[PDB]
Amino acid sequence: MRECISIHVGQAGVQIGNACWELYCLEHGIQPDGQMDSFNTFFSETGAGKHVPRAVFVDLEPTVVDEVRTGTYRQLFHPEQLITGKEDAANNYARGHYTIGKEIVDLVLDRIRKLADQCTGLQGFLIFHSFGGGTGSGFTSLLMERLSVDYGKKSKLEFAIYPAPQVSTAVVEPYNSILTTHTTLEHSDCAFMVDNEAIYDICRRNLDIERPTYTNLNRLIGQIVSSITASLRFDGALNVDLTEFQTNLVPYPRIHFPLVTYAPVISAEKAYHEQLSVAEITNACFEPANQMVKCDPRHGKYMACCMLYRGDVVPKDVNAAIATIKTKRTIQFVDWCPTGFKVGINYQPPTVVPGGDLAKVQRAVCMLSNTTAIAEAWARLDHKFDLMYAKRAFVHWYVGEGMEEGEFSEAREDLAALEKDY
Amino acid sequence: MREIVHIQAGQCGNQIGAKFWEIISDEHGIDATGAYHGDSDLQLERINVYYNEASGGKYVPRAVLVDLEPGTMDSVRSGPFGQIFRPDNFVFGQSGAGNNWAKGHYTEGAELVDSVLDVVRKEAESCDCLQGFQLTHSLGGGTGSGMGTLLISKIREEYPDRIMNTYSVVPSPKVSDTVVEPYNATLSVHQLVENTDETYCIDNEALYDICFRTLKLTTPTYGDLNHLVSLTMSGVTTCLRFPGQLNADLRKLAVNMVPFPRLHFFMPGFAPLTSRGSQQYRALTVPELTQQMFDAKNMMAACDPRHGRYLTVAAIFRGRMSMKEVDEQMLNIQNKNSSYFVEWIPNNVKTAVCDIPPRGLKMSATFIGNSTAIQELFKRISEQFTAMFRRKAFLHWYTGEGMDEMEFTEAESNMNDLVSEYQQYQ
Amino acid sequence: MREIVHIQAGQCGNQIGAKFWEIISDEHGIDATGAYHGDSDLQLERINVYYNEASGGKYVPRAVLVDLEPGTMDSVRSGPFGQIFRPDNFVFGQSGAGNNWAKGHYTEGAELVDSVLDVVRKEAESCDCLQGFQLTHSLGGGTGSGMGTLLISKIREEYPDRIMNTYSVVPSPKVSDTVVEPYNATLSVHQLVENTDETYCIDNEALYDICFRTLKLTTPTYGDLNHLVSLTMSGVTTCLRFPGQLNADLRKLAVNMVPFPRLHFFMPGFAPLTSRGSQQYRALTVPELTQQMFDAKNMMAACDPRHGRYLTVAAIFRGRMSMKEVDEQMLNIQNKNSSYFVEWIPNNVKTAVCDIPPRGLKMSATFIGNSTAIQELFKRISEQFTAMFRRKAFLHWYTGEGMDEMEFTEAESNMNDLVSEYQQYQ
Ligand SMILES: Nc1nc2c(ncn2[C@@H]2O[C@H](COP(=O)(O)OP(=O)(O)OP(=O)(O)O)[C@@H](O)[C@H]2O)c(=O)[nH]1
Ligand SMILES: Nc1nc2c(ncn2[C@@H]2O[C@H](COP(=O)(O)OP(=O)(O)OP(O)(O)=S)[C@@H](O)[C@H]2O)c(=O)[nH]1
Numbered sequence A: 001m002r003e004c005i006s007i008h009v010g011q012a013g014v015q016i017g018n019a020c021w022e023l024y025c026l027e028h029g030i031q032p033d034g035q036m037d038s039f040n041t042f043f044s045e046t047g048a049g050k051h052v053p054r055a056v057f058v059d060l061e062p063t064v065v066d067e068v069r070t071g072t073y074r075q076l077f078h079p080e081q082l083i084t085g086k087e088d089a090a091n092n093y094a095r096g097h098y099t100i101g102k103e104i105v106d107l108v109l110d111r112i113r114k115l116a117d118q119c120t121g122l123q124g125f126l127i128f129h130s131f132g133g134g135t136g137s138g139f140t141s142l143l144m145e146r147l148s149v150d151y152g153k154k155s156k157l158e159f160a161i162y163p164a165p166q167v168s169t170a171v172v173e174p175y176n177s178i179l180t181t182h183t184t185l186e187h188s189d190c191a192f193m194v195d196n197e198a199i200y201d202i203c204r205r206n207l208d209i210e211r212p213t214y215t216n217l218n219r220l221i222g223q224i225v226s227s228i229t230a231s232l233r234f235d236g237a238l239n240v241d242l243t244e245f246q247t248n249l250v251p252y253p254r255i256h257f258p259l260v261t262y263a264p265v266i267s268a269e270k271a272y273h274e275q276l277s278v279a280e281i282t283n284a285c286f287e288p289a290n291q292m293v294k295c296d297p298r299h300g301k302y303m304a305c306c307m308l309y310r311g312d313v314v315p316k317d318v319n320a321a322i323a324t325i326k327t328k329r330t331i332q333f334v335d336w337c338p339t340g341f342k343v344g345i346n347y348q349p350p351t352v353v354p355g356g357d358l359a360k361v362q363r364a365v366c367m368l369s370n371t372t373a374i375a376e377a378w379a380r381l382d383h384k385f386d387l388m389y390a391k392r393a394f395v396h397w398y399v400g401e402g403m404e405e406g407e408f409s410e411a412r413e414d415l416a417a418l419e420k421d422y
Numbered sequence B, C: 001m002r003e004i005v006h007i008q009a010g011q012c013g014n015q016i017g018a019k020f021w022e023i024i025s026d027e028h029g030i031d032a033t034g035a036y037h038g039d040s041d042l043q044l045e046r047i048n049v050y051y052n053e054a055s056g057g058k059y060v061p062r063a064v065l066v067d068l069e070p071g072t073m074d075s076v077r078s079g080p081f082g083q084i085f086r087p088d089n090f091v092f093g094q095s096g097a098g099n100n101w102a103k104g105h106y107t108e109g110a111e112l113v114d115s116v117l118d119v120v121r122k123e124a125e126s127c128d129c130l131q132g133f134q135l136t137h138s139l140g141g142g143t144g145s146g147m148g149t150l151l152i153s154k155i156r157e158e159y160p161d162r163i164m165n166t167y168s169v170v171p172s173p174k175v176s177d178t179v180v181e182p183y184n185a186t187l188s189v190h191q192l193v194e195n196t197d198e199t200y201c202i203d204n205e206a207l208y209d210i211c212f213r214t215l216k217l218t219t220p221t222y223g224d225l226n227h228l229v230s231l232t233m234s235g236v237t238t239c240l241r242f243p244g245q246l247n248a249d250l251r252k253l254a255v256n257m258v259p260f261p262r263l264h265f266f267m268p269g270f271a272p273l274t275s276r277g278s279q280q281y282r283a284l285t286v287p288e289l290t291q292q293m294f295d296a297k298n299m300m301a302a303c304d305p306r307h308g309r310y311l312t313v314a315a316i317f318r319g320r321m322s323m324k325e326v327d328e329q330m331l332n333i334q335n336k337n338s339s340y341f342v343e344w345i346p347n348n349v350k351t352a353v354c355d356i357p358p359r360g361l362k363m364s365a366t367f368i369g370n371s372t373a374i375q376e377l378f379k380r381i382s383e384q385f386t387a388m389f390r391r392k393a394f395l396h397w398y399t400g401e402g403m404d405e406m407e408f409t410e411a412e413s414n415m416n417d418l419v420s421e422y423q424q425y426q
């Protein structure tokens, strides 16, 4: 026995946390109130037939928190773990990092500290947020360094909604993205991808949902986190811990930004049309378009590859499929990283939702790597930042939060050094 | 939560605010008296932003009515939905500045500033959290501009952190309704560059031509102008008032629209706008709107953005569609309008969607954009001011209210610096 | 399947489209009313490409008729085969641009754009899959060019993936029918370099001389021009409409003819063309056609390819012969016309054959080629535009419709860049 803590900041973070808790509740049979020992990794035993999520819901705006506390799962969540803000940063990293974040970071730090107090087997921290959101950038970053300074070497996992190259809710998104990336770089143990446009494209072409909604995105995150945490929440042939995830993909602290991909995303009518075998599902998932990242991995080199099989998957078939994956030349690896393969097998089949886009299947695989194509996105973001900051636009907004342009500039050069480190 | 207090100045401003209030009563399911009858919880869940907690299951608008004459007062109160306002919010003068900025700002504004500050402070304190303000007035008029300037000054010195927008009505360049209206615009802009966080410029002749041609009406009236104004109204404020997959508020727009403190003038937008025998034949799809987002026909404040360059664009949508189509449409808009767009502000389209469409339309689209086209309007205003200030005509009315020469000189210098900065951006 | 929607602009365009439609009624065995009477399954198997499913065993052309005046409207409808068109496809104006591009594109085009977009969208949605479009208009005329530009712009912003061709009629260099026709050609080409995937240039005097000499007629008329136009018509579209051992479509031709997006102007071709007392004495064989493929006599758009260089050649055939003869003939054509051909585009002859010959001829041959000869035409147009724009004559008509100076400046700059690129290819 062991536990983990999930952190949700901003609208995207709150929605993601709610969806993930919906998964964890329906997978273990939790009714909306909390009733009917691996489920203790995310829920706490007190009283009689009771469980509550080990999470904190915080946002500078109370709209999403109000929406959460109006669902049928009010009884499921403790009221005190929901935090309501008053002044949304409005896509401003500095606003949510200094003006409102500094006076509300205390209660959250403080009581996630108790969440660790009753969880002596705290494996790590889960963070869900968005770069585009000013709250989800600033408050998330500051609480990230607060976690680092209050826990030391404790493992921490970040799930960030990176704005897409052509999808941006706010035009000031480069400022928030660059600022948060420079601020939390040294402490970000592992940060993933989310490309909204790639999610929409995959849903429209794979699930063939011409009119999807953010619920599809919500379980897109939900299924990813479920596949990641199945090892901790269910036994398997070779379970994988959170520590090994950062051990394999962080030989150097500078590069800790791996991309994620799921296989498969198939509707029930199309699930009738295809049953999964290891070779086909892996080679489909390794296909660049199947990746939920809008960056072709074949442009650069591959760091490492991690497989997360769940269900009735034969390890020998895994080895054979992975080998025949290796031999083909569409896949290339760095010279000094010949053997960077880790496989995690779990016996728990992926869980379905009623009325969901995904089809109920006994087996699945999670696609886990850190390709060099992320450098393309980083360079494009840096170029956009240079263009839109060259005339110094929207800077006065961050100035009114009380800093001058210097920190913007050296964050730009820090991220440039990160980009050229490849 | 995030309460917004409405203050209306001038006859046009009072009419606009009233029409807004009936439109909000439609959108939130409020009858002519104040009772709620909406069929969905979404209308009444966030009714507190524009309404207050009234006894007997009622709701009253969070509005402040200010004028120097009670003529439009009586017409508005005796008009439709006049009983939804308490008599206390109606505070009026008895002299009238007579389309004079100095009179309405110093002579008659001296005995109205106390009342307007008292009522706005009462509205602010009686609410939970005042997110911001919204003011409507006409820069062509003299009194309304003076009330706008006085209120923005008092708000800035009282609530420097609470942002707002001002929906001022700039006088039409083609028609000189008032001889001394250049002074009014001069002083109003000189106070707006200084006491307002962001401003939308609403020009008459552009909406007149839209009603004439796009709507295909042979008899345009103030009613249609107030209707389109209320559509702009709802389009900007629906993200805060109604739940959305991409939630937004006035603070988000202000952050996304203001690159420099003095560069805060934007030109609002609405679409689709089609008649009965075109709507049943037009495509009710996004491309029909994206061809309508960028055009000098359905264009709001009479200065063509094609001559200048767009600063950045904000687009709010209300309906049932996916988001990726919007993103690719915005990308295509950049791809084809690159020359009309700015090269050094990549992805300058602000994309957000409110889930709930307005009453009677399953889409509405509000085009919030900024371009250096307003440079032409400001330069023409400056040259007109120079033209009839070189002759020193009609200065006696202002100098009789405690005016001075070099004051107007630094006013015109401020607009000169503003237009020079806008040209430098161009 | 692969439905194509026809839109006709101007009087000449309407006449051309009508004549096409009677020719298609011949080729597909359709009577004057719409009933099918063809003797072979091949005519009626692919009738859906240009016809729609009509009740009572009938078929109606997939045509759109647009004009600013109903005079040619009434003549076309009251002319032959006028009952095969539903009254709905006939939409007309009532003012007439008077051979003015700006008027027909902005003044009178404002109230016709909605109708034309509605009808084209109805045609697109009522069909299975719209492969592409085909438009006919005259660049010499002012209104027709404006409708062509507006429709290509709207199609590009609405269906950016669906290719098409425009069969525009460039004004004859020898005759100045309209004084302001250089403006029309200027603006039409400025929109064509930008809203059209490929364009065929049809020049008057070349077809006039062909009818005079090659056909040996002392009284050339618009009827023969429309007849040869309909032959070009059938020659291009027979590969898609009719089965062939080498099947082809407009997409194949567009891929085989467009090396650069701005390099998309081609000059169509037809053969054989012989009179009664020469046909019974001429050789009805391929060499008699290959001597007719490459000649300045049977030449379409009045600019000699011999001065310039061919880009690439496309040849479609309809008859009963083997394919190797065509291949060796093309090889001989290269061998002898190497100087007139381009050295760096080897085997630049596009070879395809449609099995079914046209009605009344056991061969027809349509010569689709591209050469830098159009460089001379474009350069002469540019220098004429400079000549009468330096004097600023007849600019008032355009400036009264919302025109501007440097707009025409970038138009002429665009044609300058186009002619420079064509010369660079040469
Ligand atoms: N993938 C995904 N992203 C979402 C979802 N909801 C919101 N987002 C992200 O949130 C961004 C919009 O801004 P928010 O993060 O909501 O900003 P906010 O919550 O208002 O916080 P402030 O900007 O500080 O006021 C978008 O760019 C999205 O990337 C969702 O359901 N799915
Ligand atoms: N769109 C719109 N414009 C209006 C309306 N009423 C007046 N206007 C415009 O406002 C301008 C006059 O502004 P106005 O507010 O009447 O000046 P004023 O200073 O308040 O006038 P006074 O009270 O001193 S007498 C005119 O140009 C007129 O076109 C209206 O209902 N809708």
Ligand SMILES: Nc1nc2c(ncn2[C@@H]2O[C@H](COP(=O)(O)OP(=O)(O)OP(O)(O)=S)[C@@H](O)[C@H]2O)c(=O)[nH]1
Residues within 6 Å of the ligand: C009, C010, C011, C012, C013, C015, C016, C068, C069, C096, C097, C098, C099, C100, C138, C140, C141, C142, C143, C144, C169, C171, C177, C204, C222, C223, C225, C226
């Ligand atoms: N080949 C051919 N050319 C034609 C025919 N009718 C007109 N033309 C040519 O088209 C040119 C005029 O184009 P036209 O379409 O009539 O201009 P327009 O702008 O539409 O004229 P308007 O409607 O404003 S009055 C003339 O040079 C004429 O030679 C025709 O039936 N066949």
